[PDB]
Design a protein around this ligand. Structure first.
Ligand SMILES: O=C(O)[C@@](O)(COP(=O)(O)O)[C@H](O)[C@H](O)COP(=O)(O)O
Ligand SMILES: O=C(O)[C@@](O)(COP(=O)(O)O)[C@H](O)[C@H](O)COP(=O)(O)O
Ligand SMILES: O=C(O)[C@@](O)(COP(=O)(O)O)[C@H](O)[C@H](O)COP(=O)(O)O
Ligand SMILES: [Mg+2]
Ligand SMILES: [Mg+2]
Ligand SMILES: [Mg+2]
Ligand SMILES: [Mg+2]
Lengths: 140, 469, 465, 232, 356
């Protein structure tokens, strides 16, 4: 019987319960975006703005239902409308992470027919993050 | 000076007025497809006309008051009859109802006309409503779902995979404190949602407000621990509208994301009220379809689930249970794919191989998230992801609380299984063929998943289907 | 006894053939058709389990509580005579499982999920034993039979009603016109059709106002108390209440609700409002036959009728036996007793599977309606007795001379039958003679007798015992 | 891997997006007929397209956010232009608006889109909205009139002739008591209705609640006297 | 005053040009919820024009994308963003979803920049009850400002809203949707200056005033006239600006003019010269049309405004040196340069219909 640890075991939505994505695995996700004609976009946030929180609710009456701060991150440039080249997306990941080496960076894609984000996963976390476990230390 | 059509007392055949095989349907008409089994000696035309008549304007004998109004304008019309292949005494009767017959925004009133009395007529042996064509002009009178799929994903900030849920067990008999304890342990392991069982309302072993409070504590603990948004469908189902509202209000005041309602046992009038409250207060509304199979199981008589699903979309619901196909409860694959499209999509073309009798235009009314729940476990994951895609919630009650290591490991096993399948699909793997390989590779990697894989390896639900096309 | 993960048979926990039922238990009789290769014991146990505390695999959390205390129990299985693969499975549910005062909650447990299980081919709920301890948690009907007769000051005969026709398409003004002409000729009540709510051709508040004028004109004209069941059925609870409120403010006696299409939650709310404001509540059973028609699958109407009595209603439609809609005699006599009486003993020849003690909860007036006319009157009085409302829609508005003569014909027929019965005549044998004597005497009745003389509704019964 | 339709910043002609002469109108579209007078040097097609654009989804320069949604689904469309007989510089421009653009039950919102900004555009000299096609699917979202003609005649019990009314005069300056006195004398002579002048609200010479009371007295006196239903 | 007389057969055309509202009548009105002084005081913003921006496309964006665009706009240097006049509640985006996402966006941009932010949430609705419901939700979210279309909503609803805003401390931005139906033609209608006086009496903290130089019509002298009428306590008769009567506002608060519609960075000098600091300048297309996105678009507009403001304060004549001020600023700021390049050739110059 192994015990799932509550300590420094924060997660990051889609794919965060799998082994960290290799460069080949990221490339494959990117191909999937292009093959489906979705719009790739990168977003980033400093460590203090990375996880959902409640601080703005201090200003509220009884209306905090499904209000959270830090859902919005900051857009890297613009969504890549018309992009059909996976190498272009990979180059923007490199450029984004280089400009913000200490930020969380996620790759997302939009479907404009449904008007919704259709995919998303983390592609960088700051090296100074101590709030997460490697796969083999998630249970003890 | 010689008379026109006067009042003539007495009984005549319904077909003289209500069978109109040359009628051209209007784009604002509500259309019904009834699977109809007449009594011997009753012509299908007279049977279809009777159904059309007694669900719209007519009764068993001629009434003089018809002449004060215009029957042509208001009458339901049996406009077509198809024989059923494979059946000696079954017919599909098509009935057109003018939009004028219906109260705007009231699913209750629509059902009252279309299914109110006709199923009990002595002249028929069995009747089943298979489909309804809800025209845009009628759809637009409904508030509809509080939020719908796109808004839900946007508020939860969850994209790129199915959502994962879990019903707390045992169904009844847990204390409020133990409820919240189970909830916390499930959510912290990787599930997005947990839920009250359909029959958990307020009872001697656990009063509702105690549950709501402990659950709120559990939701916020799991959220702070994992860094992901969590929720628990708190049940607002109650004996009266006033109690139901009281429970919704408490959830709003606790700031929690989501409540649930049993729309058939609570009823459409209460459900619409709740859906409107949820829209006005920003609460998600999860719908449980308790009692549906009393109505929708048998091929010869009742109302098919696809009609109950359309009705729910009009009345209001962010989620609706859809069946699993592969779990402990019945739901044939093609039938299910049909009504999932009806729940989620803006426009669904007629397709009889999926039980869609009418092209249905939803005119931008939001889609409802299908929920697959009941007797499912980690080995079903590939098939579930293949059937539903990402716009679904998949629920593991027993498949979480039955894990040998407890709730958090159970949640983690389900979450790993879902993410592995999602990843494999995205990489170009065929989940219909390679599904077993994906799960086996994942069991070898994750000890939590391996423990789940081992316990439920031999467990399958394979039985002759009752509700066949 | 530790936690052991995995699937085991339901019957190991939920089949308890030696259980002695407690007097506070809710009991259920399920007509169950198992899939081939599923033993009846495991099927009954599955139904007991998944309608109470259990799921498809073993959960550890059971050990935190006491399954013995809370579990539903399949305690008996009868084979069905005439059937190779049908069984009556009896399930006992502890009172602790149920929310006090909530028919909604009771249905959710007992009929929520089990009808959709792959392991069964069909399931029908035939009956429920509602114990006094659970009955006492419900407000119940706003008034009930005794109080209704007392407020209306009407005794010694069945009540007479009438649905306005055509069903849809009449304007508010023409609605009230038809109502006034029916009520003035001798009917006690008229009513909105079940599907008359609020529509482009007639908005509810216009109808309510015109109908109120018509009630008061007919009452002043005849000297007898009149009413019209104004429909409060609506899309939302707030609309439903708005309509109930307008009826109260007009001082009219009675409203109606479609309890299955509106739903139990709205109905219980409405019934409580009616109790608090002194309004009669007539219940229409629109949609029941979707659920209760077929022998092999669904919920029998007697259970839907018990549920309504708990939820609340002063009247409930009962079927006619002899009219256009199905309802076998013995079945009907059974659930009429269940609706009206304080105490009904088990009687399988009438479909009563359990002795039912209503512990002084008020009785619900049965309403016989649908395809009936003057010739049916003797049979109707013989089946129902005085504590019923008999409704003639087509049988009033289809009269060759109009509504008032139609009402008069029905009233004459009813009073003639009542008088004959009171004088010692056997309505089952002498019914035709009573009607024929009355047609000879009353020209209004004669016109009705002539038009519908040949009209009968006789078909093979689907919902057989 | 050669790019599709990307974001291109800058101003382009409205007609490139919003003039669609081959569009087949849908039965749920709201249709508008604008009588349009362009400035010299502005083609009628560009003028109609501008009107269509700036009353639906578009602005004066290209915006990137268009790509997040579906312009095809939401844009107003100038689908037809008729020249006006007798006029050198007037055109009827026909615009189709998808039902999705409009708030259910709100005339306010419908006007806001269709007549909100376009009448002030420098590029036109004059604009008149001549007609609107309100589709059944949009009509059905409105409560509409409280009663309407049939119900009014039914409640008043008045049939077979036009109704007769009368505005009390002078427009302003009468006391509440003198208002009711005038009302009674009008109604008793055979009029079905009298009325407050449009500008009679509540003023120093006559407060509304005093008027309402005296008028109620007058209505009931005339009704008792004549035996016909009266109103004001 | 305008009820029936415009339809008389005996006239061919009638236009109401002006109204003298006497102090004794002015004093019967609650007037604007706050007015210019109080608005600047609550926002803690002084010494320059305010900058705003309408989100685009007008219709068709989801609530989540609305908030996304709002956050990116506000974070780059704009004080306000706004719902388009026709953005109310619609199948593509229901109002309460928008309000919530917009509230998140406001608070994120405020935390990020350290400057107070707002977004004019539209309370315009089909009924008074719906309008109020929306105002109430804004109050409960703690956000600073809502908007109303006063002519399409109507005076009766607008006055109700303005009183609610006064009682609950909400700013009220007024959009003049429909005005040009009434006020465009010289020979017939009601001149905008009368519609503006009416709004000041009914209540509003902001009112759209025209740009003079943008895509919508508004002659310079006419505009300067009614801007004085909206802002000032006392305006003397001056027929060269279309003021037919001396107007004493008897301390009723002034209304902040909003210049909006087809304007961009090159218009900045002219805008600051026409309006001075007590105005809000709005750039919808001029922000969301920037080649680098919303934040760089906002930054470019903010730089332009600040450079013009500084230049004016240093003694430069914006009417003469305006181009030089912008050119120096494009050389210095890459964000501004990108905007200057795209819209360099774009002008709106047409024969004026509403001439004095
Ligand atoms: O009460 C139950 O059995 C469940 O909680 C599932 O439990 P498990 O996860 O333990 O199986 C759900 O309510 C059913 O799935 C409903 O059926 P459906 O979705 O078909 O309406
Ligand atoms: O809609 C109808 O057909 C009726 O108005 C009767 O009309 P007529 O009097 O003209 O036959 C009643 O609602 C049915 O009797 C209901 O059936 P039940 O009572 O079995 O629920
Ligand atoms: O809908 C529009 O066109 C705007 O949003 C501006 O958009 P851009 O900034 O993209 O031009 C404004 O509502 C108009 O300026 C109103 O005109 P006025 O102020 O004259 O009443
Ligand atoms: Mg359940
Ligand atoms: Mg009826
Ligand atoms: Mg007048
Ligand atoms: Mg705008």
């Amino acid at each position: 019987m192994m015990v799932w640890t509550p300590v420094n075991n924060k997660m990051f939505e889609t794919f965060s319960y799998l082994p960290p994505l290799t460069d080949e695995q990221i490339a494959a996700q990117v191909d999937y975006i292009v093959a489906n004609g979705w719009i790739p976009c990168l977003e980033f946030a400093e460590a203090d703005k990375a996880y959902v929180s409640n601080e703005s609710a201090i200003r509220f009456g009884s209306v905090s239902c499904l209000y959270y701060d830090n859902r919005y991150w900051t857009m890297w440039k613009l969504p890549m409308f018309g992009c059909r080249d996976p190498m272009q997306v990979l180059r923007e990941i490199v450029a984004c992470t280089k400009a913000f080496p200490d930020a969380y960076v996620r790759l997302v894609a939009f479907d404009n027919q449904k008007q919704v984000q259709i995919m998303g996963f983390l592609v960088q976390r700051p090296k100074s993050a101590r709030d997460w476990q490697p796969a083999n230390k998630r249970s003890v | 000076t010689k008379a026109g059509a006067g009042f003539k007392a007495g009984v005549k055949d319904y077909r003289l007025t209500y069978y109109t095989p040359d009628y051209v349907v209007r784009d604002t008409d509500i259309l019904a497809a009834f699977r109809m089994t007449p009594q011997p000696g009753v012509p299908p035309e007279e049977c279809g006309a009777a159904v059309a008549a007694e669900s719209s304007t007519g009764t068993w004998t001629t009434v003089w008051t018809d002449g004060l109004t215009s029957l042509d304008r208001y009458k339901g019309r049996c406009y077509d009859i198809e024989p059923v292949p494979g059946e000696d005494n079954q017919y599909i009767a098509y009935v057109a109802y003018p939009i004028d017959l219906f109260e705007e925004g009231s699913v209750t009133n629509m059902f009252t006309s279309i299914v109110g009395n006709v199923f009990g007529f002595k002249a028929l042996r069995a009747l089943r409503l298979e489909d309804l064509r809800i025209p845009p002009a009628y759809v637009k009178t409904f508030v509809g779902p509080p939020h719908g799929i796109q808004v839900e994903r946007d508020k939860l900030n969850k994209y790129g995979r199915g959502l994962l849920g879990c019903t707390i067990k045992p169904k009844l008999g847990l204390s409020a404190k133990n409820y919240g304890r189970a909830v916390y342990e499930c959510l912290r392991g990787g599930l997005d949602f947990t839920k009250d069982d359909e029959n958990v309302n307020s009872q001697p072993f656990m009063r509702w407000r105690d549950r709501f409070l402990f659950v709120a504590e559990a939701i916020y603990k799991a959220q702070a621990e994992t860094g992901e948004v969590k929720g628990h469908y708190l049940n607002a189902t109650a004996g009266t509208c006033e109690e139901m509202m009281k429970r919704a209000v408490c959830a709003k005041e606790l700031g929690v994301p989501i409540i649930m309602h049993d729309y058939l046992t609570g009823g459409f009038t209460a459900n619409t009220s709740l859906a409107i409250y949820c829209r006005d207060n920003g609460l998600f509304l999860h719908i449980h379809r308790a009692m549906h199979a009393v109505i929708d199981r048998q091929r010869n008589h009742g109302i098919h689930f696809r009609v109950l699903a359309k009705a729910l979309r009009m009345s209001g619901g962010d989620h609706l249970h859809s069946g699993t196909v592969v779990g402990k409860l019945e739901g044939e694959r093609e039938v299910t794919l049909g009504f999932v499209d009806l729940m989620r999509d803006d426009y669904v073309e007629k397709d009889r191989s999926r039980g869609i009798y009418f092209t249905q235009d939803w005119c931008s009314m939001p889609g409802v998230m299908p929920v697959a729940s009941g007797g499912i476990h980690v080995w079903h994951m590939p098939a579930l992801v293949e059937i539903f895609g990402d716009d679904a919630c998949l629920q593991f009650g027993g498949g979480t609380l039955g894990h040998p290591w407890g709730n958090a490991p159970g949640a983690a096993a389900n979450r790993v299984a879902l993410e592995a399948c999602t990843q494999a699909r995205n990489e170009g793997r065929d989940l219909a063929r390679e599904g077993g390989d994906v799960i086996r590779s994942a069991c070898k990697w994750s000890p939590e998943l391996a423990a789940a894989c081992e316990v439920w390896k031999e467990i399958k639900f394979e039985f002759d289907t009752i509700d066949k096309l």
